[PDB]
């Protein structure tokens, strides 16, 4: 596009380090715009992301690097009857009434277990010592991966993150860094080595684990879903479902530390934690630009005539800084009005795990502030955020008087 010639000089590294400056230009200049290094149109404003995600003239598509990472049928990348079946597969344990029966007994002992390892130290790095472990241990136990250690689940989602976001394409539209998928292939091979025996056992001996229910629920007598049919959704879980609740927790904490009067309010009044988290997700969206839709008919959007078959990446993290919608969106503010946000997406492909995720983050922050009410951020350690497809703080050093 002529007036966006400057986009040809945007780099993958620039977007990973801090996408907000480029996307501030995009929201003003071109809410729907082809980004050469990404090889795709991207939607950057709230109105366009919401329109594309809910439009009857669009359906899900996996991003190019997403397809190389997850293959088929990834729940995020399919539609029609397959999507309907995969949604019916994952939804039972995620139903709000079901989550409310057991979420507290799942997450709160886990949060306590990780807290007891450092709560008397006076210093911690909360991303690696608390947020990521609670997130992966909670989901891992729900899925049936009790025996897979939290360090391993963390390693897997980091490798899958890097593979899914290995998006750079060169002048010819080919992947610029094909070698960057090798780590994802290696993660998937390890995952298979660990998970295949569990599937073998669940096929014959179903139990209460969520993956056993993926094999068996809704199937005729003695039949199970083929493992090749469910594995891409297992991988999808082992990236975002494992990664995002820890990142949303951590970003919420960074935001509250940026507004010390608000941190104090939340510590004194934990009923404010859910509002704190919602603002945290808007302020640094954990799934920032990981998913996409493709047009099924010609459409006109934000002044652009798109042919049928055109992918559009949904940069929800940018939409959540839309200044048409928010005042001073780059500032964390607990008392912002409770406007809709797009950090869980929208439409038939919106997040299936919202209620579960919100409770995991809530219970983790409740127990953190009960154990360490006098938490303070270590201000010499700058909080670095990293990532374009998925974004969060790389570490969160904190201190407190023991
Ligand atoms: C704070 C944590 C989380 C955030 C911010 C988040 C956000 C998202 C987003 C942005 C998408 C894509 C939506 C779209 O393209 O419109 C998504 C999809 C999805 N998420 Fe969540 N997620 C979180 C945690 C979880 C967890 C813990 C689970 C599972 C227990 C989960 C299950 C899913 C599923 C199954 C999908 C695909 C839905 C589909 O394509 O039909 N999420 N999530
Ligand atoms: C691109 O990868 C993903 C996108 C959205 C949700 C995911 O996990 C639930 C996920 O793993």
Experimental method: X-ray
Q: Which atom of ligand 1 is nearest to the CA of 281?
A: 5
Element (H, E) at 392: strand 392-393
Ligand 2 pocket member 240 (CB < 6 A): yes
CA 353, distance to chain mean position in Å, is 11
- Classify the phi-psi angles of 347: left when phi > 0, otherwise alpha if psi is within -120 to 50, otherwise beta: left
Ligand 2 centroid to residue 164 C-alpha, Å: 9
Kindly report the backbone phi and psi dihedral angles of residue 57, in degrees, each rounded to the nearest multiple of 5, phi listed first: -95, 15
Q: What is the DSSP secondary structure assignment for residue 1, as one 8-state letter?
A: -
Query: Residue 189, class by beta-carbon neighbours within 10 Å (0-12 exposed, 13-18 middle, 19+ buried)?
Result: exposed
Rounded to whole angstroms, the Cα distance separating 289 from 54 reads 16
Question: Token pair for residue 213?
Answer: 């229910």
The answer to whether 365 and 252 are in contact (CB under 8 A) is yes
- Whole-number CA gyration radius for the chain: 21
Query: Where are the strands (E) in 249-342, listed by range?
Result: 291-295, 299-301, 304-306, 311-314
DSSP states of 69-103:
HH-TT-GGG--HHHHHHHHHHHHHHHSHHHHHHHH
328 appears as a binding residue in the annotation: no
Rounded to whole angstroms, the Cα distance separating 91 from 284 reads 26
Element (H, E) at 176: none
Ligand 1 centroid to residue 390 C-alpha, Å: 12
Resolution in A: 1.8
Look at ligand 1, atom 25, and give the residue with the nearest C-alpha: 241
Q: What share of the chain is helix, strand, coil (3-state, %, to 5)?
A: 55, 10, 30
Look at ligand 1, atom 24, and give the residue with the nearest C-alpha: 241
Task: Identify the residue whose tokens are 């809530």.
Answer: 362
Q: Which atom of ligand 2 is nearest to the CA of 235?
A: 11
For residue 98, the ligand closest to its alpha carbon is: 1
Question: Token pair for residue 242?
Answer: 């494992």
| Paired sense of beta strands 304-306 and 299-301, if any | antiparallel
20 appears as a binding residue in the annotation: no
Q: Is the peptide bond before 73 cis (omega within 30 degrees of 0)?
A: yes
Which of 71, 73, 76 for mutating ligand 2's site (highest number of atoms within 8 Å of CB)?
76
Q: Which long-range contacts (CB under 8 A, 24 or more apart) does 120-126 make?
A: 120/402, 121/402, 122/399, 122/400, 122/401, 122/402, 123/378, 123/397, 123/398, 123/399, 123/400, 124/397, 124/398, 125/395, 125/396, 125/397, 125/398, 126/250, 126/253, 126/368, 126/396, 126/397, 126/398
Task: Identify the residue whose tokens are 């569990």.
Answer: 198
* Widest distance between CA atoms in the chain: 63
Ligand 1 pocket member 241 (CB < 6 A): yes
Kindly report the backbone phi and psi dihedral angles of residue 205, in degrees, each rounded to the nearest multiple of 5, phi listed first: -135, 75
Ligand 2 pocket member 236 (CB < 6 A): yes
Look at ligand 2, atom 6, and give the residue with the nearest C-alpha: 240
Rounded to whole angstroms, the Cα distance separating 283 from 343 reads 9
User: Which residues on neighbouring strands pair with residue 385, listed in sequence order?
Assistant: 393
346 appears as a binding residue in the annotation: yes
Rounded to whole angstroms, the Cα distance separating 242 from 135 reads 6
């Amino acid at each position: 596009r002529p007036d966006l010639a400057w986009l040809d000089e945007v780099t993958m590294t620039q977007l990973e380090r801090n996408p907000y400056e480029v996307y501030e230009r995009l929201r003003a200049e071109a809410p729907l715009a082809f980004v050469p290094v990404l090889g795709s149109y991207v939607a950057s404003t709230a109105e366009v992301c919401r329109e594309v995600a809910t439009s009857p003239d669009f359906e899900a598509v996996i991003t190019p690097a997403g397809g190389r990472t997850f293959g088929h049928p990834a729940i995020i990348g399919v539609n029609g009857d397959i999507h309907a079946d995969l949604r019916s597969m994952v939804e039972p344990a995620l139903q709000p009434a079901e989550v409310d029966r057991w979420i507290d007994d799942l997450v709160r002992p886990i949060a306590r277990r990780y807290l007891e390892r450092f709560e008397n130290d006076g210093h911690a790095e909360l991303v690696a010592q608390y947020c990521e472990p609670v997130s992966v241990r909670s989901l891992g136990d729900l899925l049936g991966l009790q025996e897979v250690d939290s360090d391993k689940l963390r390693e897997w989602f980091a490798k899958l993150n890097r593979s899914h976001t290995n998006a750079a394409v060169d002048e010819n539209g080919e992947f610029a860094n094909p070698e960057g998928f090798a780590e994802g292939d290696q993660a998937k091979a390890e995952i298979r080595a660990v998970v295949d025996p569990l599937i073998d056992k669940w096929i014959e001996h179903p139990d209460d684990s969520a993956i056993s229910h993926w094999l068996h629920d809704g199937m005729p007598p003695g039949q199970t879903r083929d493992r090749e049919y469910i594995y891409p959704t297992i991988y999808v879980y082992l990236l975002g479902a494992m990664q995002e609740p820890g990142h949303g927790m951590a970003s919420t904490l960074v935001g509250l530390f940026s507004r010390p009067e608000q941190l104090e309010e939340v510590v004194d009044d934990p009923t404010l934690i859910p509002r704190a988290i919602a603002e945290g997700l808007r302020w640094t969206s954990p799934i920032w630009s990981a998913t996409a839709r493709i047009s099924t008919k010609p459409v006109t959007i934000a002044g652009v005539d798109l042919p049928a078959g055109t992918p559009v990446m949904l940069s929800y993290g940018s939409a959540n800084h839309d200044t048409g919608k928010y005042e001073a969106p780059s500032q964390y503010d607990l008392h912002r009005p409770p406007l809709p946000h797009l950090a869980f997406g929208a439409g038939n492909h919106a997040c299936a795990g919202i209620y579960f995720a919100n409770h995991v983050m809530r219970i983790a922050l409740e127990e953190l502030f009960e154990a360490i009410p006098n938490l303070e951020r270590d201000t010499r350690e700058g909080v670095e955020f990293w990532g374009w497809g998925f974004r969060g703080p790389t570490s969160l050093h904190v201190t407190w008087e023991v």
